[PDB]
Design a binder for these strands. Structure first.
Length: 95
RNA sequence: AUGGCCGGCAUGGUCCCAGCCUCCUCGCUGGCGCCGGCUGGGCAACACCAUUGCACUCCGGUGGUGAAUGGGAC
């Protein structure tokens, strides 16, 4: 259990009734102030719906975002944030 | 008539205006009498069910047409 600090924050318990394009945009709307964002990956498949991967360029940003937005009401539901289990390719491709 | 198709019945005709209808050419050269049955596509939108799930491969399922009216000129 518990994951180590990552460039990517995993968010779940997201309102599934929201279309993908929008959700990505809305997330960017509230997480950009924590640092540059490389990408946000949203999938509405059975397995990946209700979750999202916010990929920050600097771990500190992900750390800040994780500590502040935890519990935040988004689309009438409280976000549940953690660090992603493994680096995201966009990250591998660099560091 | 409809995503494509057949049958029973009913029913004077053509146009104009508005209102309403719908998953499958959204609107003025689409449709808006009654009844029965045959079959295809798709989750794209809408809805419902199920799902709290760690990805970098798009990808659970089911439902709707089993729909919607009047006025006016000839």
């Amino acid at each position: 259990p518990e994951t180590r600090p990552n460039h990517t924050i995993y968010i779940n318990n997201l309102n599934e009734k929201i279309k993908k394009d929008e959700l990505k945009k809305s997330l960017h709307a509230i997480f950009s102030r924590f640092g540059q964002i490389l990408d946000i990956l949203v999938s509405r498949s059975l397995k990946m719906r209700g979750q999202a991967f916010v990929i920050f360029k600097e771990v500190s940003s992900a750390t800040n975002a994780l500590r502040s937005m935890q519990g935040f009401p988004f689309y009438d539901k409280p976000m549940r944030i953690q660090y992603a289990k493994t680096d995201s390719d966009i990250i591998a491709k660099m560091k």
